[PDB]
Write an enzyme that holds these catalytic residues in place. Structure first.
Site, PDB file in Angstrom:
ATOM      1  N   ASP A  75     -30.128   0.031  24.767  1.00  0.00           N
ATOM      2  CA  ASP A  75     -30.959   1.211  24.945  1.00  0.00           C
ATOM      3  C   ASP A  75     -32.428   0.866  24.740  1.00  0.00           C
ATOM      4  O   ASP A  75     -33.127   1.532  23.969  1.00  0.00           O
ATOM      5  CB  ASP A  75     -30.526   2.315  23.980  1.00  0.00           C
ATOM      6  CG  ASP A  75     -30.867   3.696  24.491  1.00  0.00           C
ATOM      7  OD1 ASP A  75     -31.248   3.807  25.673  1.00  0.00           O
ATOM      8  OD2 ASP A  75     -30.734   4.672  23.722  1.00  0.00           O
ATOM      9  N   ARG A 111     -23.149   3.998  26.201  1.00  0.00           N
ATOM     10  CA  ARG A 111     -21.694   3.898  26.272  1.00  0.00           C
ATOM     11  C   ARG A 111     -21.184   4.226  27.664  1.00  0.00           C
ATOM     12  O   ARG A 111     -20.292   3.546  28.177  1.00  0.00           O
ATOM     13  CB  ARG A 111     -21.054   4.835  25.241  1.00  0.00           C
ATOM     14  CG  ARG A 111     -21.160   4.364  23.806  1.00  0.00           C
ATOM     15  CD  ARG A 111     -20.863   5.501  22.847  1.00  0.00           C
ATOM     16  NE  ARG A 111     -20.881   5.066  21.455  1.00  0.00           N
ATOM     17  CZ  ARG A 111     -21.039   5.887  20.423  1.00  0.00           C
ATOM     18  NH1 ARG A 111     -21.206   7.189  20.626  1.00  0.00           N
ATOM     19  NH2 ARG A 111     -21.042   5.404  19.189  1.00  0.00           N
ATOM     20  N   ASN A 120     -35.577   4.208  26.519  1.00  0.00           N
ATOM     21  CA  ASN A 120     -34.691   4.689  25.469  1.00  0.00           C
ATOM     22  C   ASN A 120     -34.167   6.071  25.835  1.00  0.00           C
ATOM     23  O   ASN A 120     -34.937   6.957  26.218  1.00  0.00           O
ATOM     24  CB  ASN A 120     -35.412   4.737  24.120  1.00  0.00           C
ATOM     25  CG  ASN A 120     -34.465   5.039  22.955  1.00  0.00           C
ATOM     26  OD1 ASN A 120     -33.432   4.384  22.788  1.00  0.00           O
ATOM     27  ND2 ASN A 120     -34.813   6.039  22.154  1.00  0.00           N
ATOM     28  N   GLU A 151     -21.940  14.376  19.903  1.00  0.00           N
ATOM     29  CA  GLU A 151     -21.462  14.298  21.282  1.00  0.00           C
ATOM     30  C   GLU A 151     -20.123  13.575  21.380  1.00  0.00           C
ATOM     31  O   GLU A 151     -19.365  13.802  22.330  1.00  0.00           O
ATOM     32  CB  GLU A 151     -22.506  13.610  22.166  1.00  0.00           C
ATOM     33  CG  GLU A 151     -22.895  12.208  21.721  1.00  0.00           C
ATOM     34  CD  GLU A 151     -24.245  12.174  21.045  1.00  0.00           C
ATOM     35  OE1 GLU A 151     -24.422  12.905  20.048  1.00  0.00           O
ATOM     36  OE2 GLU A 151     -25.130  11.420  21.507  1.00  0.00           O
ATOM     37  N   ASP A 152     -19.810  12.711  20.414  1.00  0.00           N
ATOM     38  CA  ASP A 152     -18.559  11.963  20.455  1.00  0.00           C
ATOM     39  C   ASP A 152     -17.338  12.844  20.195  1.00  0.00           C
ATOM     40  O   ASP A 152     -16.221  12.452  20.552  1.00  0.00           O
ATOM     41  CB  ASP A 152     -18.615  10.810  19.448  1.00  0.00           C
ATOM     42  CG  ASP A 152     -18.913  11.279  18.037  1.00  0.00           C
ATOM     43  OD1 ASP A 152     -19.669  12.264  17.874  1.00  0.00           O
ATOM     44  OD2 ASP A 152     -18.392  10.659  17.086  1.00  0.00           O
ATOM     45  N   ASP A 171     -23.670  -2.082  14.107  1.00  0.00           N
ATOM     46  CA  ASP A 171     -23.753  -2.251  12.662  1.00  0.00           C
ATOM     47  C   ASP A 171     -22.389  -2.470  12.009  1.00  0.00           C
ATOM     48  O   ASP A 171     -22.295  -2.433  10.776  1.00  0.00           O
ATOM     49  CB  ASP A 171     -24.434  -1.032  12.031  1.00  0.00           C
ATOM     50  CG  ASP A 171     -25.942  -1.056  12.186  1.00  0.00           C
ATOM     51  OD1 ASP A 171     -26.630  -0.382  11.390  1.00  0.00           O
ATOM     52  OD2 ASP A 171     -26.442  -1.752  13.096  1.00  0.00           O
ATOM     53  N   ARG A 204     -18.820   3.414   1.998  1.00  0.00           N
ATOM     54  CA  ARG A 204     -19.043   4.194   3.207  1.00  0.00           C
ATOM     55  C   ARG A 204     -17.802   5.030   3.473  1.00  0.00           C
ATOM     56  O   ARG A 204     -16.701   4.486   3.606  1.00  0.00           O
ATOM     57  CB  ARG A 204     -19.356   3.263   4.382  1.00  0.00           C
ATOM     58  CG  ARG A 204     -18.931   3.761   5.740  1.00  0.00           C
ATOM     59  CD  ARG A 204     -19.952   4.698   6.331  1.00  0.00           C
ATOM     60  NE  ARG A 204     -19.462   5.296   7.568  1.00  0.00           N
ATOM     61  CZ  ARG A 204     -19.483   4.690   8.751  1.00  0.00           C
ATOM     62  NH1 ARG A 204     -19.979   3.464   8.863  1.00  0.00           N
ATOM     63  NH2 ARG A 204     -19.011   5.312   9.821  1.00  0.00           N
TER      64      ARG A 204
END
Length: 337
Positions: A40, A75, A67, A177-178, A93, A126
């Protein structure tokens, strides 16, 4: 090819290699999978670090001319390029277990899954969804498991499942959005599987957000499923949404003067949910659905404040549960527990 690992990148210089390393240590032939990187428009040299692997990894690399502000467009460009039979979206990451595509390909051919969830593990402290990864199961549905409580794209999808039914990430909306993406894949898959024999994936304004939730509600209610089942899937989504999303407690955290913006956007989402579905939801959320649908922030906030303080205008205790009236002249809401 069997798989297409999909990597959206933007300024991923600092940890892209640990990802690309895990893809190289795969107990799986580099012949049968590709890594599809779509950048991106990074400023640093992520794409140069990625180029070090073009002679060890089957590798595809694009870069967007500007961007897009999110992983959706990267994706989607990678998804259209992919030739593999199955697809896996990974965060730059993050990194994956060495046995991952080894164990997934073995699982996939036993039970021809359309969607395969692979157990996740948090690193560095996490939070990771856990409730649906306690067992390995070749067949789970949206109503007998907790897969609706994990809508990240860090899962394995059959490529044709997404392509035949035009499942793509929203590019215009950039909050959650996922969830629309994974919900569509769930509703369209003929077989969903969960594989937990080990830990494979390692994890290191309201108008846009609730526009996505409204589209999810629209998507469930128009699926090619029985009417009673569609209502129950949407009820389970609303349970999850009101328990874990930013909707939970928003009238207690959001500044008073921004709250009319939230109730208006939340109401357009809830107005896509037929009132009949409120009866299928956890009883404590029925008052919230009620005043959200009426776009009444004062009563909505009173309910949430009442819950938080344990102070109610009137209530009865029937069968060990609360029948609550939150304000004078308002209806009683029953069975709250």
């Amino acid at each position: 090819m069997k798989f297409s690992v999909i990597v959206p990148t933007y300024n991923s210089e600092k940890y892209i290699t640990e990802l690309l390393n895990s893809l190289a240590k795969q107990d799986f032939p580099k012949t049968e999978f590709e890594v599809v990187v779509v950048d991106d428009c990074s400023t640093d040299q992520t794409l140069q670090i990625v180029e070090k692997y073009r002679n060890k990894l089957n590798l595809k690399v694009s870069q967007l001319e500007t961007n897009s502000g999110g992983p959706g467009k990267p994706r989607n460009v990678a998804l259209k390029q992919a030739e593999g039979e199955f697809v896996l979206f990974v965060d730059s990451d993050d990194y994956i277990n060495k046995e991952t595509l080894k164990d997934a390909a073995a699982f996939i051919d036993e039970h021809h899954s359309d969607v395969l969830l692979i157990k996740m593990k948090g690193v560095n402290g996490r939070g990771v969804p856990q409730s649906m990864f306690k067992e390995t199961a070749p067949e789970v549905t949206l109503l007998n498991s907790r897969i609706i409580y994990t809508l990240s794209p860090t899962k394995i999808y059959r490529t044709a499942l997404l392509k035949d039914n035009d499942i793509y990430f929203p590019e215009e909306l950039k909050s959650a959005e996922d969830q629309l993406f994974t919900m569509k894949a769930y509703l369209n898959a003929n077989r969903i599987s969960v594989l937990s024999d080990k830990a494979y994936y390692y994890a290191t304004s309201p108008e846009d957000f609730y526009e996505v939730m409204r589209l999810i509600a629209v998507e469930i209610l128009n699926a090619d499923l029985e009417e009673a089942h569609k209502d129950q899937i949407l009820a389970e989504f609303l349970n999850r949404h009101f328990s874990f999303s930013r909707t939970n407690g928003f009238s207690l955290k959001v500044k008073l003067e921004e709250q009319p913006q939230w109730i208006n956007a939340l109401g357009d989402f809830i107005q896509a949910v037929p009132e009949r579905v409120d009866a299928l939801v956890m009883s404590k959320l029925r008052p919230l659905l009620h005043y959200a649908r009426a776009k009444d922030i004062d009563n909505y906030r009173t309910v949430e404040e009442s819950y938080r303080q344990g102070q109610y205008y009137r209530f009865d205790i029937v069968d060990g549960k609360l029948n609550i009236q939150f304000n004078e002249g308002e209806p009683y809401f029953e069975g709250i527990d």
